[PDB]
């Protein structure tokens, strides 16, 4: 696993501030660990702390 920013399809990033729940959601996703990350380089999102393979995160394109 490693750290990443954490995302959900079709390449959608996860706004925070509002839900304040990325530890729970990373957690459950499988994830060591996981918050809000205000202040990225595609702006506020979710960030992820160890990240299995199987759960990838956001990549540079557009959202579907």
Do not use: F, H, M
Not at 14 to 33: H, P, R, W
Request: charged share 20%; aromatic share 10%; proline share 6%.
């Amino acid at each position: 696993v490693r750290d990443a920013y954490i995302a959900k399809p079709e390449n959608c990033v996860y706004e925070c501030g509002i839900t304040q729940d990325c530890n729970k959601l990373c957690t459950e996703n499988g994830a060591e660990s996981g918050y809000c990350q205000w202040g990225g380089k595609y702006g506020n999102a979710c960030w992820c702390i160890k990240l299995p393979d199987s759960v990838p995160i956001r990549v540079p394109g557009k959202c579907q």
